[PDB]
Amino acid sequence: HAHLKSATPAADSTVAAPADLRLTFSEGVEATFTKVSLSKDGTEVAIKGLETPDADKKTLVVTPAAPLAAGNYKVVWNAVSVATHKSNGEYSFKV
Ligand SMILES: [Cl-]
Ligand SMILES: [Cl-]
Ligand SMILES: [Cu+2]
Numbered sequence: 643h644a645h646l647k648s649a650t651p652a653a654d655s656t657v658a659a660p661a662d663l664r665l666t667f668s669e670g671v672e673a674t675f676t677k678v679s680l681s682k683d684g685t686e687v688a689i690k691g692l693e694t695p696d697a698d699k700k701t702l703v704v705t706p707a708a709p710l711a712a713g714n715y716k717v718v719w720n721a722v723s724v725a726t727h728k729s730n731g732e733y734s735f736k737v
């Protein structure tokens with residue numbers, strides 16, 4: 643199963659408004675079937691796009707519609723690996 647190994651913004655870190663979120667998994671994930679919920683103080687934030695650029699499909703780029711307002715973000719993810727297996731988790735961060 644795909645484990646989330648790291649993100650940027652990194653879990654609990656503080657950053658300036660990033661362009662996007664990068665989620666780096668122990669395995670290839672499918673952009674098509676993978677879900678990522680981004681919420682800011684308990685309100686859905688608009689994700690415009692999910693993509694795996696590289697061919698290993700290990701890094702998931704999650705592009706919000708707007709650049710991110712300063713504050714507290716919860717990421718809830720439901721990965722679907724290149725072998726079709728579902729895993730899930732969550733983490734927080736701030737800008
Ligand atoms: Cl995990
Ligand atoms: Cl959304
Ligand atoms: Cu597995």
Ligand code: NA
Nearest residue numbers: 725726727728
């Ligand atoms: Na199976």
